[PDB]
């Protein structure tokens, strides 16, 4: 498997593929991603950190941006409280076995040089484009603040200031990244990860929506979450359980079933799993049971590293 | 005449009068006003500098903000070009006989402390309120930039940062100042000057509209400007010539007329002038002639100080 294909695997898009080609040649190449500090670290975070680990294994230096100032602008509270949580997030990522450097946005986002460029970019950025870029990101507010249109230009300027080759983020970030590619002199290669569906299937997974599995959820908690989860027979799209199977499980996957229901099933790939499920040849209870047990195993080392802190 | 009434004279409003009362008590009191550097300095500028001179005579320390960064945000060009013009504006104000300290916005508007508060204020400032505050200020643009909503919070933060007691500006600034009074812990007393009508009477006077008399216009230029100016018999409102008489001329004013047209008229106050003109008892040609000659005299020392530079 290519380093390219290893990097491309399970991404929603690379902007652009030929551009990524060029970067892979280099000895020195860097990639960063920003995270607003979150009270719980969930599968969504995990998916992205897994992609950063991919990049690290292809020889990228990795920078995690602990986005205290962006979180501040996106109404997550006071900065000092925001930074404390960022520190906790850092520990979780390390328990994920990521080898990276961690930087707080505010370490550089208030330098005079950075600020001056925020204002330069603000002259090039229409209010309509700025608001369009925040539709999937901004905290819901009946009375949108000026902060909301400041956010995207912070994210763009940061890509510029730190001189990174590759920016990684969820699909919700794509309009900001297209703005960055258009407004900056050096085009940053953008890799976008899919946004996981929440457990009830009604929206995207989100640490503010209570529709996630956190990486340190107890095994009984994990089982109950999955048991309740949206998962219609034959329905793959918008199905969070199938998403967990696609994004986190390793194959071949043995699905344990009673003999009376067809006995143990061994699936060699996710594509084969998808066809079984679509054919209504694998029942949601059996899929749920396996995903839950295998996910528990996957997240075990992470929970244990966090638990040993006491 | 009160110091209060001397300060109040020819202002559109004081926010608020009782607040200004309190400030006048102090030994140390400061007032500032910001100017976007302008290629020509006109009667509009002059009116405001005259009001600053009023404040200076009531014992205020005066600060002129050479607003290079605001001008930068309001699409007036590159900063280095903006600052050069600011320097020229400074010289014109000194030739007006103003005794003040002059500061460039950018001397302090990129400090880390200032910037951080711009972001704090941006969290309190709705996009709708911010755009409403810029309706009379923003350079026309079919595609409004994020810079436009950054401007009002710069102006608000500057009032905060420099700790000024009194902010002065034209009426067009009033929504920004109300925002400042609501968002800041210390309420700044705001004094608003009327906005002069352009010479053709079709809009407000403005150095980008070519409807002004500049303080250093030649006497023949001044006469031709006035001769062409909008000035209907009996019509006071929106009449720039009457505005010049109200705001710049001293009384008693002798209006010279041929004997065949009623001979020389001596008016003791602007209110008396207004009633003469409304009654169609003073013809626009005679009013124009006098305003032009007296304005020429008024602006003479200013033109001469600038001319001696060569
Ligand atoms: Na090498
Ligand atoms: Na004293």
Nearest to B77 by CA among B157, B168, B147: B147
Nearest to A154 by CA among A107, A115, A112: A115
Query: Quick check: A108 and A64 in contact, CB under 8 A?
Result: no
Instruction: Write the residue in B122, B123, B147 that is nearest to A119 by C-beta.
Output: B147
End-to-end CA distance of chain A: 40
Show Cβ contacts of residue A171 under 8 Å, excluding neighbours closer than 6 positions: A12, A13, A192, A193, A194, A195
* Residue of A106, A112, A145, A157 best to disrupt the B interface, most CBs of B under 10 A: A145
Domain locations in chain A?
1-196, 197-310
Nearest to B130 by CA among B145, B146, B147, B152: B152
CA angle B158, B161, B162 (to 5 degrees): 85
For residue A8, CA distances in Å to A4, A14, A32, A97 come to 6, 7, 16, 20
Class for the domain spanning B197-310: mainly alpha
Strand partners for B42: B214
CB-hemisphere CA count at 13 Å for B152?
Answer: 32
Cβ distance B145 to A127 less than 8 Å, yes or no, reads yes
User: Which string of DSSP letters, residue by residue, matches B203-225?
Assistant: SB--TTTT---BTT--HHHHHHH
* β-pair type (A13-15, A189-193): antiparallel
Residues A219 and A304: their CA atoms lie apart, in Å, by: 12
Closest ligand to the CA of A25: 1
Please list the helix, strand and coil fractions of chain B in percent, rounded to the nearest 5, in that order.
50, 15, 35
* Residue of A69, A119, A121, A132 best to disrupt the B interface, most CBs of B under 10 A: A119
* Residue of B69, B70, B109, B119 best to disrupt the A interface, most CBs of A under 10 A: B119
Query: Quick check: A153 and A118 in contact, CB under 8 A?
Result: yes
Nearest CA in chain A to B153: A146
Q: What residues are neighbours of ligand 2 (ion), with CB under 5 Å?
A: B 27
Cβ distance B145 to A123 less than 8 Å, yes or no, reads yes
Chain A residues within 8 A of B156 when measuring between CB atoms: none
Chain B residues within 8 A of A104 when measuring between CB atoms: none
Q: What is the resolution of this structure in A?
A: 2.0
Query: Quick check: A119 and B72 in contact, CB under 8 A?
Result: yes
Cβ distance A69 to B119 less than 8 Å, yes or no, reads yes
Helix or strand or coil: residue B192?
Answer: strand
Query: Quick check: A74 and A139 in contact, CB under 8 A?
Result: yes
Residues A35 and A86: their CA atoms lie apart, in Å, by: 8
Residues B173 and B170: their CA atoms lie apart, in Å, by: 6
Chain B residues within 8 A of A115 when measuring between CB atoms: 110, 115
Chain B residues within 8 A of A116 when measuring between CB atoms: 110
Nearest to A218 by CA among A310, A89, A307: A307
Please list the helix, strand and coil fractions of chain A in percent, rounded to the nearest 5, in that order.
50, 15, 35
The set of long-range contacts for B13-17, using a CB threshold of 8 Å and a minimum separation of 24, is B13/B171, B13/B174, B13/B191, B13/B192, B14/B189, B14/B190, B14/B191, B14/B192, B15/B174, B15/B177, B15/B178, B15/B181, B15/B189, B15/B190, B15/B191, B15/B192, B16/B189
Instruction: Please tell me what DSSP assigns to residue B195.
Output: P
Query: Quick check: B149 and A146 in contact, CB under 8 A?
Result: yes
C-alpha of residue A53 to centroid of ligand 1, in Å = 22
Residue B78 distance to chain A (closest CA, Å): 10
Peptide bond into A64 cis (omega under 30): no
Residues B104 and B158: their CA atoms lie apart, in Å, by: 11
E runs forming strands in chain A: 13-15, 30-35, 61-66, 101-104, 166-170, 189-193, 253-255, 265-267
Instruction: Please tell me what DSSP assigns to residue B145.
Output: B
Nearest to A23 by CA among A200, A186, A246, A145: A186
Q: Is B69 part of the contact surface with chain A (CB cutoff 8 Å)?
A: yes
Helix or strand or coil: residue A81?
Answer: helix
Cβ distance B145 to A122 less than 8 Å, yes or no, reads yes
Interface contacts A/B by beta carbons within 8 Å: 85
Nearest to B168 by CA among B21, B30, B40, B302: B30
Strand partners for B13: B192
Residue B102 distance to chain A (closest CA, Å): 22
Cβ distance A125 to B111 less than 8 Å, yes or no, reads no
Instruction: Write the residue in A116, A148, A150 that is nearest to B110 by C-beta.
Output: A116
Neighbours of B261 (CB within 10 A): 11
Residues A87 and A100: their CA atoms lie apart, in Å, by: 14
For residue A208, CA distances in Å to A200, B67, B130 come to 14, 42, 28
Q: Is B261 part of the contact surface with chain A (CB cutoff 8 Å)?
A: no
Q: Is A130 part of the contact surface with chain B (CB cutoff 8 Å)?
A: yes
Q: What residues are neighbours of ligand 1 (ion), with CB under 5 Å?
A: A 27
Nearest to B89 by CA among B108, B71, B75: B71
Residue B1 distance to chain A (closest CA, Å): 45
Nearest to A106 by CA among A80, A137, A131: A80
Q: Is A148 part of the contact surface with chain B (CB cutoff 8 Å)?
A: yes
Query: Quick check: B179 and B152 in contact, CB under 8 A?
Result: yes
Residues B27 and B22: their CA atoms lie apart, in Å, by: 11
Nearest to B57 by CA among B14, B98, B94, B103: B98
Q: Is A123 part of the contact surface with chain B (CB cutoff 8 Å)?
A: yes
E runs forming strands in chain B: 13-15, 30-35, 61-66, 101-104, 166-170, 189-193, 253-255, 265-267
Nearest CA in chain B to A106: B116
Determine the CATH number of domain A1-196: 3.40.50.620
C-alpha of residue B3 to centroid of ligand 2, in Å = 17
End-to-end CA distance of chain B: 40
Q: Is B41 part of the contact surface with chain A (CB cutoff 8 Å)?
A: no
Nearest to B266 by CA among B242, B299, B289, B290: B290
For residue A23, CA distances in Å to A17, A30, A183, B76, B208 come to 10, 9, 20, 39, 48
Residues B29 and B122: their CA atoms lie apart, in Å, by: 29
Lay out the sheet containing A166-170: strands in order across.
A13-15, A189-193, A166-170, A30-35, A61-66, A101-104
């Amino acid at each position: 498997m290519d380093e390219f294909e290893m990097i491309k695997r399970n991404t929603s898009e690379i902007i652009s593929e030929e551009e990524l080609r060029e970067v892979l040649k280099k000895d020195e190449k860097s990639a960063h991603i920003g995270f607003e500090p979150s009270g719980k670290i969930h599968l969504g975070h995990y998916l992205q950190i897994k992609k950063m680990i991919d990049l690290q294994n292809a020889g990228f230096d990795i920078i995690i941006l602990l986005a205290d100032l962006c979180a501040y602008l996106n109404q997550k509270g006071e900065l000092d409280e925001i930074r404390k949580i960022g520190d906790y997030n850092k520990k979780v990522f390390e328990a994920m076995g990521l080898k990276a450097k961690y930087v707080y946005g505010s370490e550089f986002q208030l330098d005079k040089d950075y600020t001056l460029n925020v204002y330069r970019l603000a002259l090039k950025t229409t209010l309509k484009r700025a608001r369009r870029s925040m539709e999937l990101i901004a905290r819901e507010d009946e009375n949108p603040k000026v902060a909301e249109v400041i956010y995207p230009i912070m994210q763009v300027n940061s890509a510029h200031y730190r001189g990174v080759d590759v920016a990684v983020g969820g699909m919700e970030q794509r309009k900001i990244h297209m703005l960055a590619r258009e407004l900056l002199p050096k085009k940053v290669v953008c890799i976008h990860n899919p946004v996981l569906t929440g457990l009830d299937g009604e929206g995207k997974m989100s640490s503010s929506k209570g529709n996630f599995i956190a990486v340190d959820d107890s095994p009984e908690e994990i089982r109950a979450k999955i048991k309740k989860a949206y998962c219609p027979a034959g329905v793959v799209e918008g199905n969070p359980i199938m998403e967990i199977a696609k994004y986190f499980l390793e194959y071949p996957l043995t699905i344990k079933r009673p003999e009376k229901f067809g006995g143990d099933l061994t699936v060699n790939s996710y594509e084969e799993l998808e066809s079984l499920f679509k054919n209504k040849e694998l029942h949601p209870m059996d899929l749920k049971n396996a995903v839950a047990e295998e996910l528990i195993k996957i997240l075990e080392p992470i929970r244990k590293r966090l638990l040993e802190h006491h």
